[PDB]
Design an enzyme around this catalytic site. Structure first.
Site, short mmCIF file in Angstrom:
data_model
loop_
_atom_site.label_atom_id
_atom_site.label_comp_id
_atom_site.label_asym_id
_atom_site.label_seq_id
_atom_site.Cartn_x
_atom_site.Cartn_y
_atom_site.Cartn_z
CG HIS A 61 -1.58 1.30 1.56
ND1 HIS A 61 -2.44 2.01 0.71
CD2 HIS A 61 -1.45 2.06 2.67
CE1 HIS A 61 -2.77 3.16 1.31
NE2 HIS A 61 -2.18 3.22 2.50
CG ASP A 91 9.87 18.60 -24.81
OD1 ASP A 91 10.32 17.84 -23.88
OD2 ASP A 91 8.82 18.36 -25.42
CD1 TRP A 126 6.43 3.25 5.17
CD2 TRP A 126 7.62 4.10 3.48
NE1 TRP A 126 6.70 4.56 5.50
CE2 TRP A 126 7.41 5.12 4.44
CE3 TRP A 126 8.33 4.40 2.30
CZ2 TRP A 126 7.99 6.39 4.33
CZ3 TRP A 126 8.84 5.72 2.14
CH2 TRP A 126 8.67 6.70 3.15
CB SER A 156 12.39 6.59 -12.59
OG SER A 156 11.42 7.49 -13.10
CG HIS A 240 11.98 14.87 7.10
ND1 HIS A 240 10.77 14.72 7.75
CD2 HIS A 240 11.90 16.03 6.40
CE1 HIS A 240 10.05 15.80 7.50
NE2 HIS A 240 10.69 16.62 6.70
CD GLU A 242 9.79 10.25 -1.36
OE1 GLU A 242 8.69 9.87 -1.95
OE2 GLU A 242 10.71 10.68 -2.01
CE1 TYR A 244 8.25 19.14 5.42
CE2 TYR A 244 10.00 17.52 5.81
CZ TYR A 244 9.04 18.38 6.32
OH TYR A 244 8.75 18.49 7.66
CG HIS A 290 11.21 13.77 13.06
ND1 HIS A 290 11.22 15.01 12.45
CD2 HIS A 290 10.67 12.91 12.12
CE1 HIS A 290 10.69 14.93 11.24
NE2 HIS A 290 10.42 13.65 10.96
CB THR A 316 4.94 24.87 7.25
OG1 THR A 316 6.09 24.04 7.11
CG2 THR A 316 3.75 24.21 6.59
CE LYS A 319 4.37 26.95 0.15
NZ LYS A 319 4.68 28.18 -0.66
NE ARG A 438 3.00 3.16 11.43
CZ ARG A 438 3.80 3.96 10.73
NH1 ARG A 438 4.44 4.98 11.36
NH2 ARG A 438 3.88 3.86 9.42
C1 HEA Z 1 3.16 15.09 3.05
C2 HEA Z 1 3.93 14.32 3.89
C3 HEA Z 1 4.32 14.77 5.25
C4 HEA Z 1 4.53 16.06 5.70
C5 HEA Z 1 4.46 17.41 4.95
C6 HEA Z 1 4.83 15.97 7.05
C7 HEA Z 1 5.07 17.15 7.87
C8 HEA Z 1 5.46 17.05 9.26
N1 HEA Z 1 5.63 15.88 10.02
FE1 HEA Z 1 5.30 13.98 9.39
N2 HEA Z 1 5.21 12.12 8.65
C9 HEA Z 1 4.84 11.70 7.40
C10 HEA Z 1 4.45 12.52 6.28
C11 HEA Z 1 4.55 13.96 6.37
N3 HEA Z 1 4.87 14.67 7.51
C12 HEA Z 1 4.92 10.33 7.24
C13 HEA Z 1 4.56 9.49 6.06
C14 HEA Z 1 5.30 9.88 8.50
C15 HEA Z 1 5.55 8.50 9.02
C16 HEA Z 1 6.50 7.62 8.23
C17 HEA Z 1 6.35 6.17 8.67
O1 HEA Z 1 6.77 5.95 9.84
O2 HEA Z 1 5.85 5.34 7.85
C18 HEA Z 1 5.46 10.97 9.33
C19 HEA Z 1 5.98 10.81 10.65
C20 HEA Z 1 6.37 12.01 11.41
C21 HEA Z 1 7.02 11.93 12.66
C22 HEA Z 1 7.55 10.70 13.41
C23 HEA Z 1 6.48 10.19 14.38
C24 HEA Z 1 6.83 8.78 14.82
O3 HEA Z 1 7.26 7.92 13.98
O4 HEA Z 1 6.68 8.54 16.04
C25 HEA Z 1 7.17 13.22 13.15
C26 HEA Z 1 7.87 13.64 14.38
O5 HEA Z 1 8.32 14.72 14.65
C27 HEA Z 1 6.60 14.08 12.17
C28 HEA Z 1 6.46 15.52 12.36
C29 HEA Z 1 6.04 16.32 11.22
C30 HEA Z 1 6.15 17.72 11.27
C31 HEA Z 1 6.50 18.52 12.49
C32 HEA Z 1 5.77 18.15 10.04
C33 HEA Z 1 5.69 19.60 9.57
O6 HEA Z 1 6.38 19.76 8.27
C34 HEA Z 1 4.30 20.25 9.54
C35 HEA Z 1 4.26 21.79 9.52
C36 HEA Z 1 2.85 22.25 9.22
C37 HEA Z 1 2.17 22.84 10.20
C38 HEA Z 1 2.72 22.99 11.57
C39 HEA Z 1 0.78 23.33 9.95
C40 HEA Z 1 0.69 24.71 9.23
C41 HEA Z 1 1.06 25.90 10.14
C42 HEA Z 1 0.41 26.96 10.77
C43 HEA Z 1 -1.05 27.19 10.70
C44 HEA Z 1 1.35 27.90 11.53
C45 HEA Z 1 1.46 28.06 13.03
C46 HEA Z 1 1.78 26.69 13.61
C47 HEA Z 1 2.35 26.56 14.80
C48 HEA Z 1 2.72 27.74 15.64
C49 HEA Z 1 2.65 25.18 15.31
N4 HEA Z 1 6.12 13.33 11.12
C1 HEA Z 2 0.33 9.06 -0.54
C2 HEA Z 2 0.37 8.20 0.45
C3 HEA Z 2 -0.78 7.49 0.93
C4 HEA Z 2 -2.11 7.47 0.62
C5 HEA Z 2 -2.72 8.30 -0.53
C6 HEA Z 2 -2.81 6.60 1.40
C7 HEA Z 2 -4.19 6.28 1.33
C8 HEA Z 2 -4.89 5.47 2.25
N1 HEA Z 2 -4.36 4.85 3.34
FE1 HEA Z 2 -2.39 4.71 3.78
N2 HEA Z 2 -0.45 4.55 4.24
C9 HEA Z 2 0.61 5.18 3.72
C10 HEA Z 2 0.51 6.15 2.66
C11 HEA Z 2 -0.73 6.54 2.00
N3 HEA Z 2 -1.94 6.01 2.31
C12 HEA Z 2 1.83 4.84 4.24
C13 HEA Z 2 3.20 5.44 3.89
C14 HEA Z 2 1.50 3.91 5.24
C15 HEA Z 2 2.49 3.25 6.24
C16 HEA Z 2 2.95 1.83 5.75
C17 HEA Z 2 3.81 1.08 6.82
O1 HEA Z 2 3.33 1.14 7.99
O2 HEA Z 2 4.86 0.58 6.44
C18 HEA Z 2 0.10 3.79 5.22
C19 HEA Z 2 -0.57 3.00 6.14
C20 HEA Z 2 -1.98 2.96 6.29
C21 HEA Z 2 -2.69 2.35 7.29
C22 HEA Z 2 -2.12 1.73 8.58
C23 HEA Z 2 -1.77 0.21 8.34
C24 HEA Z 2 -1.16 -0.37 9.62
O3 HEA Z 2 -0.56 0.39 10.43
O4 HEA Z 2 -1.33 -1.61 9.83
C25 HEA Z 2 -4.02 2.53 7.03
C26 HEA Z 2 -5.10 2.09 7.88
O5 HEA Z 2 -6.28 2.45 7.82
C27 HEA Z 2 -4.10 3.25 5.81
C28 HEA Z 2 -5.33 3.52 5.10
C29 HEA Z 2 -5.41 4.28 3.92
C30 HEA Z 2 -6.64 4.54 3.30
C31 HEA Z 2 -8.00 4.01 3.77
C32 HEA Z 2 -6.32 5.31 2.23
C33 HEA Z 2 -7.17 5.87 1.11
O6 HEA Z 2 -8.14 4.82 0.69
C34 HEA Z 2 -7.92 7.16 1.46
C35 HEA Z 2 -8.71 7.75 0.23
C36 HEA Z 2 -7.76 8.04 -0.94
C37 HEA Z 2 -7.88 7.62 -2.20
C38 HEA Z 2 -9.10 6.85 -2.65
C39 HEA Z 2 -6.80 8.04 -3.22
C40 HEA Z 2 -7.27 8.02 -4.64
C41 HEA Z 2 -6.32 8.74 -5.56
C42 HEA Z 2 -6.21 8.25 -6.80
C43 HEA Z 2 -7.02 7.06 -7.21
C44 HEA Z 2 -5.35 8.91 -7.84
C45 HEA Z 2 -6.26 9.44 -9.00
C46 HEA Z 2 -5.30 10.01 -10.05
C47 HEA Z 2 -5.58 10.98 -10.97
C48 HEA Z 2 -6.96 11.54 -11.04
C49 HEA Z 2 -4.57 11.49 -11.96
N4 HEA Z 2 -2.85 3.52 5.34
C1 LIG Z 3 7.16 13.92 8.87
N1 LIG Z 3 8.19 13.46 8.91
CU LIG Z 4 10.21 13.19 8.78
#
Ligand code: HEA
Ligand code: HEA
Ligand SMILES: [C-]#N
Ligand SMILES: [Cu+2]
Ligand SMILES: CCCCCCCCCCCCCCCCCC(=O)OCC(COC(=O)CCCCCCCCCCCCCCCCC)OC(=O)CCCCCCCCCCCCCCCCC
Ligand SMILES: CCCCCCCCCCCCCCCCCC(=O)OCC(COC(=O)CCCCCCCCCCCCCCCCC)OC(=O)CCCCCCCCCCCCCCCCC
Ligand SMILES: CCCCCCCCCCCCCCCCCC(=O)OCC(COC(=O)CCCCCCCCCCCCCCCCC)OC(=O)CCCCCCCCCCCCCCCCC
Ligand SMILES: CCCCC/C=C\C/C=C/C/C=C/C/C=C\CCCC(=O)O[C@H](COC(=O)CCCCCCCCCCCCCCCCC)COP(=O)(O)OCCN
Ligand SMILES: CCCCC/C=C\C/C=C\C/C=C\C/C=C\CCCC(=O)O[C@H](COC(=O)CCCCCCCCCCCCCCCCC)COP(=O)(O)OCCN
Ligand SMILES: CCCCC/C=C/C/C=C/CCCCCCCC(=O)O[C@H](COC(=O)CCCCCCCCCCCCCCC)COP(=O)(O)OCC[N+](C)(C)C
Ligand SMILES: CCCCCC/C=C\CCCCCCCCCC(=O)O[C@H](COC(=O)CCCCCCCCCCCCCCC)COP(=O)(O)OC[C@@H](O)CO
Ligand SMILES: CCCCCCCCCCO[C@@H]1O[C@H](CO)[C@@H](O[C@H]2O[C@H](CO)[C@@H](O)[C@H](O)[C@H]2O)[C@H](O)[C@H]1O
Ligand SMILES: CCCCCCCCCCO[C@@H]1O[C@H](CO)[C@@H](O[C@H]2O[C@H](CO)[C@@H](O)[C@H](O)[C@H]2O)[C@H](O)[C@H]1O
Ligand SMILES: C[C@H](CCC(=O)O)[C@H]1CC[C@H]2[C@@H]3[C@H](O)C[C@@H]4C[C@H](O)CC[C@]4(C)[C@H]3C[C@H](O)[C@]12C
Ligand code: CUA
Ligand SMILES: [Mg+2]
Ligand code: NA
Ligand SMILES: [Zn+2]
EC number: 7.1.1.9
Lengths: 514, 84, 41, 144, 49, 73, 104, 46, 227, 93
Positions: A61, A91, A126, A156, A240, A242, A244, A290, A316, A319, A438
């Site tokens: 997934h 292009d 993953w 790629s 990390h 990734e 962003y 983190h 952030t 933005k 999880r």
């Molecule tokens: C689009 C993808 C995406 C993005 C942008 C972010 C953005 C952020 N993530 Fe997240 N993160 C994930 C995808 C993402 N993350 C994924 C996939 C994981 C788990 C991976 C895995 O384990 O599989 C994860 C896991 C993850 C962890 C680890 C948790 C754990 O494993 O126990 C942490 C810890 O610090 C973290 C923190 C943050 C923070 C602080 C931001 C910041 O960049 C967010 C900043 C945005 C805001 C804060 C909101 C907008 C702001 C305002 C309105 C301004 C004023 C705000 C304040 C004064 C607070 N993320």
């Molecule tokens: C982009 C990243 C992404 C997206 C989109 C999603 C989408 C969804 N994820 Fe995702 N998920 C992850 C990234 C994402 N996930 C990752 C990184 C993990 C952690 C894996 C790990 O633990 O190792 C995770 C784990 C995770 C779990 C936890 C599993 C576990 O801990 O055992 C669950 C549980 O409910 C969940 C549910 C869903 C559901 C219900 C949706 C969606 O069904 C929600 C609705 C969204 C859609 C239906 C998307 C449709 C978009 C398209 C079809 C594209 C169309 C294209 C064009 C029009 C050009 N996800």
């Molecule tokens: C979010 N890392």
């Molecule tokens: Cu990170």
């Protein structure tokens, strides 16, 4: 002619179309995988009766949604279609290498399918951490096919990053500085720099995993003096950046959509938006640990990584507030793309705030490896990315195809998806705070109510995805051809008509210096 | 290399001003915070008259000959220990 | 945006057909697999 | 009148309340009587009739502000259809419950839950706020 | 001239809402789903040992 | 029969923003005094009230007599 | 720059005797981007520019854009029309309401 | 050259809407069905 | 343990977990301030037909909206770091206990005095005694003295696992070749539950942790009886 | 030293040679340089070369604006930037 055009392409629009088709197909795969996850969890007990299979479904997934849906759609699809048009270029810099970036993806996805069909699959997460992903706990070909799938997707994207950086630096009109290019183009450049620097570190780490599995190295094996935690540092040093990379093009598209449907010629605070994306790009390399607060990390390192992670909310926030300031005073047009962008702002803000909670390593001890993390990233990343992709797809579908969508159906689709994703992921905060881990196939009975609601939510978003396919069909079935598009003076990609000719900007734009 | 910017194009005055105000001065502000948080006086260590420290092979050419140039009575003991 | 009227209008009946076919294409194969899960197990 | 695809690079007409005077007139070709009306517009407008004034407006513009800004009943279709499809989703969930899911574990039987609840109270689960805090150990009942 | 929303919007809203409430209430209450709510105020604790 | 008075014509959007940003602020203040009172303060009192006369041995003896322990009958 | 200085530059803009059609449209399309309903004295100058350009329809549209710029402040448009009645009568400009163009 | 214009800058035909529905059905339906069949495959090995 | 429909953290069993609850409440008070502020402001931007579409000067407002978030982050960071360094403070344990993760069970070693060790496996659902908790009970609980500072050392003899007890605020990864230290102190007797918290294969969901906290004298006699 | 290495004058071909020869004549048929603006009044419009009857102009109306204003310039009477009014006239063919 068909093979020359579609298998031998050197055209940025056709390649962009190939990436959008590939990414939409991958999104079906990744959605079906997510529905199997939620079906296993939708009542207590076992559904599949095979938790190795459950773990394989979770792992695939995430790889499908990240490497085959979001990155190909945002960078390969919207980037290839839009970047050259938005700078008036004929292009990409390397139009033939661009086609190899596309064609490496079907083989990468085939390797990931292969991994799941042979042996018992790669049930690793993953993150692919050893020793679970090593050759004793995951003996046989599945993990190696996953590693090779990642290698191909990395090549790629690294070649694609080279192409985008070169095109954006070298192929603008001579009078256009970098501070006259649109924010989407900035967001792709910065994403490409992050790809260039981070994917080679992943490639090194997964190659060390491959050699520990097959060449009797011991990078990650303590029996040889190796260390499992070294793999985690190399993985997260990429991972990390990734997250962003996955959202930055979405920020770019959101800036264009919010500006367009506000009736404005420009986003509020352009240089602040460039500053914020550059700052996020730079700080995105210094926070990775983190993801490792529970590995046995010294307190001063925990304090540093907590503090650096907090510094990222500042750019952030500029933005988010700048998107609100773009809406301010707008002649707001309540188009379906505008609804997707406003949904994005809300959902991204919720997810970013729970990331701020997680940043505190003391709280993260209790929240790590629970559904609170799954809820944070399905808001801020998964659904932030999907809502920006759907906003951009709805907004630019008439450019790419020449046909219009039915806006009433598109608003119905948005409404169903907004209910579905919130019903799915909001309850996961409660599951995480109350301690549900999880990566589990079943849960202690106390957690039943919220898992039941979350799984019912997942079926609502299924209905929305089915309706999206019908909506695309109805547009191509009805053939309503575009006539006039507003605001072309500040949206250059539309000025060649819909769809633009195969070659555009054969005569470049005229832009003088003054 | 392990950066994360973009711009290139031209590095002119506008870009270097952007770096000055957008990266360099914020970094100074943050380290000024970090530093003005770990400020404060720690407990000075027991005096031990180690023979490799407080070296006196010739009197200093100022004061009483026995005080270093930026002598701080709170933290710099004399060869005979801290001052009263 | 403005646009021409449909070159090939899709009536309500035709939309009901396209919607029904689209939904069945997603629902029937997965439904068959899930209905037969215990057979596999 | 008729806008053509091949005209995409020419100045175009739009009705937008924030762009009140578009780049071209809505109607560019004039009949004999419309030509005569444009000549009459060169004289005092007090001599034009109401119908002639409306006609001049409709040559210059397609829709008035009131027409271009009209609200619609679209929200009813959108909300109603969204609720239909959410309702359709519950049909899928009913199907899943009937044909896919088997029985849940025996720990959800009423007697099990009653014994498990007593045992949780005997171990004082969440005794500060969450659970046992809500039981009256002295009265042997849930706090009211 | 009245459009689709003028002609059918009221019926789509009313029938969609009625259908949605009816089918979700049925699913939630009539097919054996175990929501596992809190025992507080609900369950009479019974001797286990 | 009477002329209409001249109304304010300039800065109507900025005026609306200024007024409501204030309302937005005073709502966040009015909320935090509430959330602190209904949640945070409630929790401080609950823990302090619980532990004020808490007797861990009496709690243990109750649990032991209820049969919960492996190590204590 | 003061309000009166702003109003006076705009009055001068529309009073240019040989203002052309492009300048009329550029002026009105720019003016409506600002956070204000234009003062009657600006609207007067624009309407007389429409007269010099033999463009009755644009005069009516300018009155519509005044009502639109006031948003929910329903008192502004009737005041502006009141202040413009001598010019409306002088030039034979009918309001959108007198032409039925306020109906949907 | 190549065909340009709506309906012509895509690798699939939209000349007949019913043939298109079949093609879109097979395309998106195959991606959605694949994980269910992979799961079935893994269960049938045990 | 968690209870049905729980929204927040388990009640605190140790003073550190109580500190975390108060700090989470603080962070949430701020989170709710920011979230409702954003929602109110965006709604305001979207609910007027008044317009202002000419270029807007940005620098003034960007100061407000960088400085305010920075202040907020400092107001979160200060208590966050205090708790972090407080959790790190030496406490002088009275007892050291090791736990080794395995696929899929935990073993425990209490070797300060005698060679005491045993394995701890989930009770299968079919064998639960009436009123026992599905997926949470074990055959052999980790009996420990209440009201005493305990050093736990965590490792693994195969893949990664992670040893967690949410109500004590504990989660320490179990890594082969590494001996990670954490400290534990329960203010109360009772039974405190956790679950393996790093994916370790097919039975990751099914290798739980049960601490049984009792007076020292009962722990001593239990330890002797387990030799 | 010795010789034996061809020069660009000897051996450049195709478009590379076209660009090289034009640069020697101070010409820029392949648009490598930014054009310098005139005063842009109706009397002194910016002159926009084209090989066809229309070309897209981007106008950076004031120095350092980040927003570029884009429009097609057609053969015929000079047109004005819709933002700043500066004049441009197409010089085809
Ligand atoms: C689009 C993808 C995406 C993005 C942008 C972010 C953005 C952020 N993530 Fe997240 N993160 C994930 C995808 C993402 N993350 C994924 C996939 C994981 C788990 C991976 C895995 O384990 O599989 C994860 C896991 C993850 C962890 C680890 C948790 C754990 O494993 O126990 C942490 C810890 O610090 C973290 C923190 C943050 C923070 C602080 C931001 C910041 O960049 C967010 C900043 C945005 C805001 C804060 C909101 C907008 C702001 C305002 C309105 C301004 C004023 C705000 C304040 C004064 C607070 N993320
Ligand atoms: C982009 C990243 C992404 C997206 C989109 C999603 C989408 C969804 N994820 Fe995702 N998920 C992850 C990234 C994402 N996930 C990752 C990184 C993990 C952690 C894996 C790990 O633990 O190792 C995770 C784990 C995770 C779990 C936890 C599993 C576990 O801990 O055992 C669950 C549980 O409910 C969940 C549910 C869903 C559901 C219900 C949706 C969606 O069904 C929600 C609705 C969204 C859609 C239906 C998307 C449709 C978009 C398209 C079809 C594209 C169309 C294209 C064009 C029009 C050009 N996800
Ligand atoms: C979010 N890392
Ligand atoms: Cu990170
Ligand atoms: C530009 C405007 C549009 C912009 C909008 C973007 C569009 C997106 C939304 C608009 C979406 C509209 C969708 C239209 C359906 C496209 C159907 C198609 O037939 O696409 C076009 C086809 C050619 O087909 C046709 O030409 C049909 C018309 C004429 C051909 C005659 C014969 C018909 C043959 C049968 C067709 C089979 C269909 C597939 C059947 C599939 C069966 C499998 O070719 C190609 O170039 C392929 C393009 C790339 C495919 C990437 C996915 C590959 C995934 C697999 C990875 C491998 C491992 C997976 C395994 C991993 C598992 C883990
Ligand atoms: C307005 C405040 C929004 C603040 C929230 C921002 C974040 C969320 C974004 C979420 C985006 C917010 C959408 C706001 C509705 C705009 C009304 C409008 O003036 O629309 C334009 C008008 C035409 O109006 C005009 O002619 C000029 C105006 O169209 C109409 O008659 C019908 C418009 C239908 C839109 C309904 C979409 C509802 C989706 C909400 C998600 C849950 C759905 C639950 C359906 C029921 C499920 C059970
Ligand atoms: C976000 C999208 C939301 C979509 C669904 C909206 C539903 C949530 C309703 C809309 C959001 C409000 C959250 C309800 C939290 C209840 C609570 O007091 O939770 C307390 C703590 C733990 O506290 C305790 O120690 C136990 C609490 C005391 C129990 C007594 C019950 C009193 C509250 C009853 C809640 C019932 C269950 C709700 C179940 C909901 C299921 C979906 O939980 C938590 O931390 C949860 C942490 C989530 C972090 C969210 C980030 C910001 C989102 C806020 C929305 C934006 C603007 C608001 C206004 C938003 C309006 C749109
Ligand atoms: C603010 C940052 C520092 C700025 C500079 C401040 C003054 C330093 C001057 C630099 C000259 C560098 C010569 C280095 C000589 C030693 C000075 C080292 C720097 C200094 O200032 O050291 C001080 C000692 O100064 C002392 O002895 C007294 C030093 C004064 C006498 C110096 C005499 C010797 C000079 C000889 C120069 C020869 C150069 C030849 C060049 C030939 C090249 C072809 C340290 O103070 P302290 O109380 O011991 O400890 C602090 C306890 N709280
Ligand atoms: C301990 C770990 C060890 C690991 C292994 C270590 C290996 C180190 C490797 C060493 C590589 C060594 C040298 C190879 C050099 C080849 C570069 C070739 C190009 C070249 O040489 O041309 C240069 C081009 O400049 C230009 O604008 C170039 C412009 C490029 C633009 C890219 C833009 C990307 C975005 C940047 C934004 C930054 C914003 C802040 C001229 O510069 P120079 O003064 O001669 O200095 C070269 C110094 N090495
Ligand atoms: C975690 C929380 C963190 C903190 C969040 C803090 C948010 C702080 C937000 C600030 C709100 C208050 C800002 C008020 C700005 C209102 C602008 C204004 O006050 O007026 C507008 C000024 O325009 C000009 O110069 C330039 C145009 C306006 C310049 C400012 C633009 C408005 C910006 C609004 C931002 C709204 C969204 C904020 C999102 C948080 C002008 O209108 P006028 O028609 O009168 O001009 C005509 C002038 N003549 C006639 C004299 C020439
Ligand atoms: C486990 C084993 C996994 C193995 C996976 C192997 C995957 C890939 C197979 C590779 C097949 C390579 C075939 C040759 C490619 C040559 C590309 C090239 O040379 O591309 C050039 C551009 O890239 C440039 O310069 C600069 C870039 C040149 C890149 C050359 C190719 C490198 C491929 C691998 C590198 C990966 C990165 C490793 C570090 C992480 C030219 O661009 P074109 O658009 O073609 O033409 C443009 C015309 O104007 C030229 O006249
Ligand atoms: C998460 C994604 C999945 C979401 C929900 C899918 C919803 C179900 C759609 C219907 O699926 C069909 O259901 C039938 C039952 O209703 C099955 O027939 C089965 O059952 C019938 C009735 O007992 C027999 O007639 C058939 O031969 C037997 O295959 C049939 O195979 C399957 O295609
Ligand atoms: C793309 C996805 C391809 C999925 C192929 C699944 O194939 C199945 O494998 C089973 C063995 O485990 C067979 O028994 C079964 O008959 C077969 O259909
Ligand atoms: C100087 C640079 C570019 C200005 C320009 O040439 O247009 C601008 C663009 C964004 C600005 C930054 C952002 O607006 C964010 C911060 C805002 C604070 O008020 C000052 C520091 C702050 C970090 C700003 C410093 C500086 O003014 C920046 C970096
Ligand atoms: Cu052991 Cu998870
Ligand atoms: Mg972990
Ligand atoms: Na399950
Ligand atoms: Zn200009």
């Amino acid at each position: 002619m068909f093979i020359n055009r579609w298998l031998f392409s050197t055209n940025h629009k056709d390649i962009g179309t190939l990436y959008l088709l590939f990414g939409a197909w991958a999104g079906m795969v990744g959605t079906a995988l997510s529905l199997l996850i939620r079906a296993e969890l939708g009542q207590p007990g076992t559904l599949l009766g095979d938790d190795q299979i459950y773990n394989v479904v979770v792992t695939a997934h995430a790889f499908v949604m990240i490497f085959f849906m979001v990155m190909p759609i945002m960078i390969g699809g919207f980037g290839n279609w839009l970047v050259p048009l938005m700078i008036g270029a004929p292009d990409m810099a390397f139009p033939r290498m661009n086609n190899m970036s596309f064609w490496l993806l079907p083989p990468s996805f085939l390797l990931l399918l292969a991994s799941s069909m042979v042996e018992a699959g790669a049930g690793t997460g993953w993150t692919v951490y050893p020793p679970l992903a090593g050759n004793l706990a995951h003996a046989g070909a599945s993990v190696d096919l996953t590693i090779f799938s990642l290698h191909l997707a990395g090549v790629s994207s690294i070649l694609g990053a080279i192409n985008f950086i070169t095109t954006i630096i070298n192929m603008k009109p001579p009078a256009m500085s970098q501070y006259q290019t649109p924010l989407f183009v900035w967001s792709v450049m910065i994403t490409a720099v992050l790809l260039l620097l981070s994917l080679p570190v992943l490639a090194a780490g997964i190659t060390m995993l491959l050699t520990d599995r097959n060449l009797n190295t011991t990078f990650f094996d303590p029996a040889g003096g190796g260390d499992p935690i070294l793999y985690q540092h190399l993985f997260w040093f990429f991972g990390h950046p990734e997250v962003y990379i996955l959202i930055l093009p979405g920020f770019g598209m959101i800036s264009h959509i919010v500006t367009y449907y506000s009736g404005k010629k420009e986003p509020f605070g352009y240089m602040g938006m460039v500053w914020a994306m550059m700052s996020i790009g730079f700080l995105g390399f210094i926070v990775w640990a983190h993801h490792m607060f529970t590995v046995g990390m010294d307190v001063d390192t925990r304090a540093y990584f907590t503090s650096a992670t907090m510094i990222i909310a500042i750019p952030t926030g500029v933005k988010v507030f700048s998107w609100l300031a773009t809406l301010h005073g707008g002649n707001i047009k309540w188009s379906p793309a505008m609804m997707w962008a406003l949904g994005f702002i809300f959902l991204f803000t919720v997810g970013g705030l729970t990331g701020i909670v997680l940043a505190n390593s003391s709280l993260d001890i209790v929240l790590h490896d629970t559904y609170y993390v799954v809820a944070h990233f399905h808001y801020v990343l998964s659904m932030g990315a999907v809502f920006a992709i759907m906003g951009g797809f709805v907004h630019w579908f008439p450019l790419f195809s020449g046909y219009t969508l039915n806006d009433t159906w598109a608003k119905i689709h948005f409404a169903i998806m907004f209910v579905g994703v919130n019903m799915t992921f909001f309850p996961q905060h409660f599951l995480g705070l109350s301690g549900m881990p999880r990566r589990y196939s079943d849960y202690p009975d106390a957690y039943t109510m919220w898992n039941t609601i979350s799984s019912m939510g997942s079926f609502i978003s299924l209905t929305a995805v089915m309706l999206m396919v019908f909506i695309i069909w109805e547009a191509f079935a009805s053939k309503r051809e575009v006539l006039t598009v507003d605001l072309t003076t500040t949206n250059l990609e539309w000025l060649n008509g819909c769809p633009p000719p195969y070659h555009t900007f054969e005569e470049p734009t005229y832009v003088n210096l003054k | 290399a392990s950066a994360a910017k973009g711009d290139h194009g031209g590095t002119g005055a506008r870009t270097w001003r952007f770096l000055t105000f957008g990266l360099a001065l914020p970094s100074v502000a943050l380290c000024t915070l970090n530093s003005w948080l770990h400020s404060g006086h720690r407990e000075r260590p027991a005096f031990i008259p180690y023979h490799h420290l407080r070296i006196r092979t010739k009197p200093f050419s100022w004061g009483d000959g026995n005080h270093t140039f930026f002598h701080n009575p709170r933290v710099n003991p004399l060869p005979t220990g801290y001052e009263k | 945006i403005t646009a021409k009227p449909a070159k090939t209008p899709t009536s309500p009946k035709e939309q009901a057909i396209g919607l029904s076919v689209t939904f069945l294409s997603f629902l029937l194969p997965a439904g068959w697999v899930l209905y037969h899960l215990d057979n596999y197990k | 009148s008729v806008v053509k695809s091949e005209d995409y690079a020419l100045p175009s007409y739009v009705d937008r309340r924030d762009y009140p005077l578009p780049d071209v007139a809505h109607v560019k070709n004039l009949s004999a009587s419309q030509k005569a009306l444009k000549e009459k517009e060169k004289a005092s407008w007090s001599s034009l009739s109401i119908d002639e004034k409306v006609e001049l407006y409709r040559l210059k513009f397609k829709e008035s502000f009131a027409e271009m800004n009209r609200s619609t009943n679209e929200w009813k279709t959108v909300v109603g259809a969204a609720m239909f499809f959410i309702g359709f989703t519950a049909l899928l969930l009913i199907w899943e419950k009937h044909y896919v899911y088997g029985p849940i574990p025996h720990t959800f039987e009423e007697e099990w839950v009653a014994k498990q609840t007593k045992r949780m109270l005997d171990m004082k689960v969440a005794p500060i706020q969450g659970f046992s805090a809500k039981w009256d150990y002295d009265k042997n009942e849930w706090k009211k | 001239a009245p459009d689709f929303h003028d002609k059918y919007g009221n019926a789509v809203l009313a029938s969609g809402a009625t259908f949605c409430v009816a089918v979700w209430v049925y699913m939630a209450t009539q097919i054996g789903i175990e929501w596992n709510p809190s025992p507080v105020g609900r369950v009479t604790p019974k001797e286990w040992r | 029969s009477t002329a209409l008075a001249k109304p304010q014509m300039r800065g109507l959007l900025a005026r609306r923003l200024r007024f409501h940003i204030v309302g937005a602020f005073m709502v966040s203040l009015g909320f935090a005094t509430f959330y602190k009172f209904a949640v945070a303060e409630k929790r401080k009192k609950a823990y302090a009230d619980f532990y004020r006369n808490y007797d861990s041995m009496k709690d243990f003896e109750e649990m032991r007599k209820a049969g919960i322990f492996q190590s204590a009958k | 720059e003061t309000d009166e200085e702003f109003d006076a530059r705009w009055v001068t803009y529309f009073n240019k005797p040989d203002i052309d059609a492009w300048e009329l449209r550029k002026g009105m399309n720019t003016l409506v981007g600002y956070d204000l309903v234009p003062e009657p004295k600006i609207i007067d100058a624009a309407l007389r520019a429409c007269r010099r350009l033999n463009d009755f329809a644009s005069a009516v549209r300018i009155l519509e854009v005044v009502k639109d710029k006031a948003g929910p402040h329903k008192e502004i448009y009737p005041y502006v029309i009141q202040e413009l009645r001598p010019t409306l009568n002088e030039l034979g400009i009918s309001t959108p309401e007198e032409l039925g163009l306020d109906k949907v | 050259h190549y065909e340009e214009g709506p309906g012509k800058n895509i690798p699939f035909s939209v000349e007949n809407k019913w043939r298109l529905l079949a093609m879109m059905t097979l395309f998106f339906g195959s991606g959605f069905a694949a994980p269910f069949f992979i799961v079935r495959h893994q269960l049938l090995k045990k | 343990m968690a209870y049905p429909m729980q929204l927040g953290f388990q009640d605190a069993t140790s003073p550190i977990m109580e500190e975390l609850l108060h700090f989470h409440d603080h962070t949430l008070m701020i989170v709710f301030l920011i979230s409702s502020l954003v929602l109110y402001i965006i709604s305001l931007m979207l609910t007027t037909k008044l317009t202002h579409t000419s270029t807007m000067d940005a620098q003034e407002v960007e100061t407000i909206w960088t400085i305010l978030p920075a202040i907020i982050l400092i107001l979160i960071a200060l208590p966050s770091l205090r708790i972090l360094y407080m959790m790190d403070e030496i406490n002088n344990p009275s007892l050291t206990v090791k736990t080794m993760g395995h696929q899929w069970y935990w073993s425990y070693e209490y070797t300060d005095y005698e060679d005491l060790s045993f394995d701890s496996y989930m009770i299968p659902t079919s064998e639960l005694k009436p009123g026992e908790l599905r997926l949470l009970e074990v055959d052999n609980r980790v009996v420990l003295p209440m009201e005493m500072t305990i050093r736990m050392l965590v490792s693994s003899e195969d893949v990664l696992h992670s040893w967690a007890v949410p109500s004590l605020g504990l989660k320490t990864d179990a890594i082969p070749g590494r001996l990670n230290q954490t400290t534990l102190m329960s203010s109360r007797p009772g039974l405190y539950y956790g679950q393996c918290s790093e994916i370790c294969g097919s039975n990751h969901s099914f290798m739980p942790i049960v601490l049984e906290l009792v007076p020292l004298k009962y722990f001593e006699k239990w330890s002797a009886s387990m030799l | 030293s010795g010789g034996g290495v061809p020069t660009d004058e000897e051996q450049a071909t195709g478009l590379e040679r076209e660009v090289m020869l034009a640069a020697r004549k101070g010409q820029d048929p392949y648009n490598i340089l930014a054009p310098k603006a005139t005063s842009g009044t109706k009397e002194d419009p910016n002159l926009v070369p084209s090989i066809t009857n229309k070309r897209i102009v981007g106008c950076i109306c004031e120095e350092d604006n980040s927003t570029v204003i884009w429009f097609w310039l057609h053969k015929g009477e000079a047109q004005r930037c819709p933002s700043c009014g500066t004049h441009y006239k197409l010089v085809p063919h």
